Each structure stands twice: as structure tokens, then as C-alpha cells.
Design a binder for these strands. Structure first.
Ligand SMILES: Nc1nc2c(ncn2[C@H]2C[C@H](O)[C@@H](COP(=O)(O)OP(=O)(O)OP(=O)(O)O)O2)c(=O)[nH]1
Ligand SMILES: [Ca+2]
Ligand SMILES: [Ca+2]
Ligand SMILES: [Ca+2]
Length: 341
DNA sequence: GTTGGATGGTAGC
DNA sequence: CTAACGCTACCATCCAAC
């Protein structure tokens, strides 16, 4: 079983250079404006020229404009990007029919049946790299290893424009040496209790017991981490099916005025039912984000699929239900559908 | 003495 | 208006219905 993995490089940004090569070699920042006020909102992504200064995805657009006044600030075009993804995802079907679209820029492959050893695998990722580059002008990063995790890890090591094989032997090696907070599945919070026990190596896990660990990080995590440490771990490729569909909007000013929030909410519902396209959901959750940016929500689940009209009326209740229990002014509000038939 | 649902915690794009 | 998008997936916890 050989698992190759691909993660496109500074994606949305790289796409924009493709369209506007006069940007090439000059820091670019891809923005999710929010119409609150001029330059309100956050950064989706930015290229490596920009990242050198500290402008990562996440940071507020006003921080970036502080840091990089003379850069190119661009409004995110998810739809344009989704196209370059889609196409690039169809190429990858030429190489393997066992393909698991992870994100918009990431897909795993099972090439195990297409090649025989990591050397032939290497050669594939190399052609795969050239395939995409010739047809879409996008550099990517290929990460190869025996299973999904380490593949995603082997790429995260090669980024950008890299290609990296992690073979059985190098795998023994990382379990011992790889810094725990670099494992896919580990955020800062979990990466913070891990030092609290002593587990800094992906293998350290094995020097602690079984329980207290889980009593600190949870059941799935213990049975995730320990398996990798004991290298028994193996996660299979499957085609992923979208389980939820949302839309959420920031309001021009914070409110508790139901007649003020309503039109914003009805926006989300409309654009949701389009983003649905034929999927009939049985569950709705109205999610609002509050002033202190704590995100809070209320949902309902129907024994049957919901019509557009149903969710119009049901969402209102839910918003009321939210107004009943949190007395804080709402800042962003949207809706979320799940449990499709 | 589970199964699911309602809310939220964490982690990654 | 005065900083913090928008999106998805998965697990942990808690309380009722069975
Ligand atoms: N709105 C928004 N978009 C994001 C966020 N994180 C990532 N994206 C978008 C922009 C990225 O190009 C794309 C994939 O995320 P990545 O982790 O791959 O960042 P990126 O690929 O641009 O860096 P790069 O490929 O790794 O060297 O999705 C985020 O927090 N918010
Ligand atoms: Ca990625
Ligand atoms: Ca990427
Ligand atoms: Ca981490």
C-alpha cells in the first residue's frame, strides 16, 4: 500500500499570479473583506513573498495593510479558484481511481496498485507535478509514504514546490524524532497538555500509560496517537461526502434587533439552498457569532427533509431561541444544513 | 444502560 | 464603522427517550 498526497502551493495566491503574472515576484495578499468598514475582515492566504513579513492566513486585513502597505490586496474569488481546483482534481483521476479529495487544494491517492516501490512512486509524483504545471501553471507539493498521515507529513516537510518520500525506515525515525505538535490532528491546546505530561515526541506517548492520557486529550486522540507511535495505525482512502452546507454573514453593525438581523439571515438561507443543489437536508442550525466572538448556536432536526419555506420559518424561531438565552449583541449570523437524504 | 440530539471544543482549510 | 472571514469535519459532554 503506497499513499501519495498532493497539496497545491500558496493556492489562491498562486492562482492569482497565474491570472496576473505582473504580480509574480511581488507580495500578494488574498482578502476576505466583510463590508463592515473599509478593510474589515481577514486574510485567506498570501504568497511566500508576503509571508516572509508575517502576513499569514488568518490575521486581520488591517494588520497586513499596516505591515505591507505597498502590496497587492485582492478580493477572494472562491468560485474562480474552485474551477482551477476542479480541473486539477480531474487530472489526478488519470493517475488513480482511489482518490480522496480532502480540501480545495489537497487530495490523497492510493497509487499502491499503479507502482511497486517508493522509487516508482517518486517518479510518479514527478510526472504528476509536471502534468499540473504544463496544464494549469500551478506548482504543487507531493508527499509520499505508506499511509495518509505520514504522506501529509512528508509534504508539510517539502513545501513549497517539493516532493518527498518517507519510507518505512524514515518512518521508524520520525516516531522517535518528529516534534509532537507537527502531527496532523494536533492544535496548540492539545500541543500544550502534551508538554504537560512529557510527550514531546510522537513516541513519548508510549512512556506514559493509557488512561490519564485520554483523560487529558480524549479517546479518539489516544487511539489515534498511540497507534502511530506503535506504527500499527492505518487509515484508508475513501471518497468523501459533504455532510454539511453553510453560509454566514457579518452584519454592518452589531445588534439584538430581530428585525435588523432578519434580512442578513435570509441571505444565508437563500445562498445555502443554492449551495445545496438537490440535497434535501433534515436538519438546520442557526449559528450566530457574538460581540466577544464566542460562537453560539441552536438547531432543530426534522424526521423529514426541509423545504426552503420551512427553514425560513424555523430559523426565525431558532434565532429567537438564541436571543432568549444569550443576552449579548450578535455580530455575525448565518445558517447551516446537515443530515441529507 | 445504549442511541440520538442538542450545543460546543478543537483542528485545518 | 474603528481587530478577529468564512467554511467544514470530527469528538466530548450532557440529558431524554427508550
Ligand atoms: N478564508 C480562508 N481561506 C483559507 C484559510 N486557510 C486556507 N485558506 C484557503 C487559502 C489557501 O490557499 C487554501 C489552502 O490552505 P493552505 O493551508 O494550503 O494555505 P496555502 O496553500 O495557500 O499555503 P501553501 O500551499 O501551503 O504553501 O485555502 C483560512 O483560514 N481562511
Ligand atoms: Ca493543505
Ligand atoms: Ca496548500
Ligand atoms: Ca500543530
Amino acid at each position: 500500500g503506497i499513499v501519495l498526497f498532493v497539496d497545491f502551493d500558496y493556492f489562491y495566491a498562486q492562482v492569482e499570479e497565474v491570472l496576473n503574472p505582473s504580480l509574480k515576484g511581488k507580495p500578494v495578499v488574498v482578502c476576505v473583506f466583510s463590508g463592515r468598514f473599509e478593510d474589515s475582515g481577514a486574510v485567506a492566504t498570501a504568497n511566500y513573498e508576503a509571508r516572509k513579513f508575517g502576513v499569514k492566513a488568518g490575521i486581520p486585513i488591517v494588520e497586513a495593510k499596516k505591515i505591507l502597505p505597498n502590496a497587492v490586496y485582492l478580493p477572494m474569488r472562491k468560485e474562480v479558484y474552485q474551477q482551477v481546483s476542479s480541473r486539477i482534481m480531474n487530472l489526478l483521476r488519470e493517475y488513480s481511481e482511489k482518490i480522496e479529495i480532502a480540501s480545495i487544494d489537497e487530495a490523497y491517492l492510493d497509487i499502491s496498485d499503479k507502482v511497486r516501490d517508493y522509487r516508482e512512486a517518486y517518479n510518479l509524483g514527478l510526472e504528476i507535478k509536471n502534468k499540473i504545471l504544463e496544464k494549469e501553471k500551478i506548482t504543487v507539493t507531493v508527499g509520499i509514504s505508506k499511509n495518509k498521515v505520514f504522506a501529509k507529513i512528508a509534504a508539510d516537510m517539502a513545501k513549497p514546490n517539493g516532493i518527498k518520500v518517507i519510507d518505512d525506515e524514515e518512518v521508524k525515525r520520525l516516531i522517535r524524532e518528529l516534534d509532537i505538535a507537527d502531527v496532523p490532528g494536533i492544535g496548540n491546546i492539545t500541543a500544550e497538555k502534551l508538554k504537560k505530561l512529557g510527550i514531546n515526541k510522537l513516541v513519548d506517548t508510549l512512556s506514559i500509560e493509557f488512561d490519564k492520557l485520554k483523560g487529558m486529550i480524549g479517546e479518539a486522540k489516544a487511539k489515534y496517537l498511540i497507534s502511530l507511535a506503535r506504527d500499527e495505525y492505518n487509515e484508508p482512502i475513501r471518497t468523501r461526502v459533504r455532510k454539511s452546507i453553510g453560509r454566514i454573514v457579518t452584519m454592518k453593525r452589531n445588534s439584538r434587533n430581530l428585525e435588523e438581523i432578519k434580512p442578513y439571515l435570509f441571505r444565508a438561507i437563500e445562498e445555502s439552498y443554492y449551495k445545496l443543489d438537490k440535497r434535501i437536508p433534515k436538519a438546520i442550525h442557526v449559528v450566530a457569532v457574538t460581540e466577544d466572538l464566542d460562537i453560539v448556536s441552536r438547531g432543530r432536526t426534522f424526521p423529514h427533509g426541509i423545504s426552503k419555506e420551512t427553514a425560513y420559518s424555523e430559523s426565525v424561531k431558532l434565532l429567537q431561541k438564541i436571543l432568549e438565552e444569550d443576552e449579548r449583541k450578535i455580530r455575525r449570523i448565518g445558517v447551516r444544513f446537515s443530515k441529507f437524504i
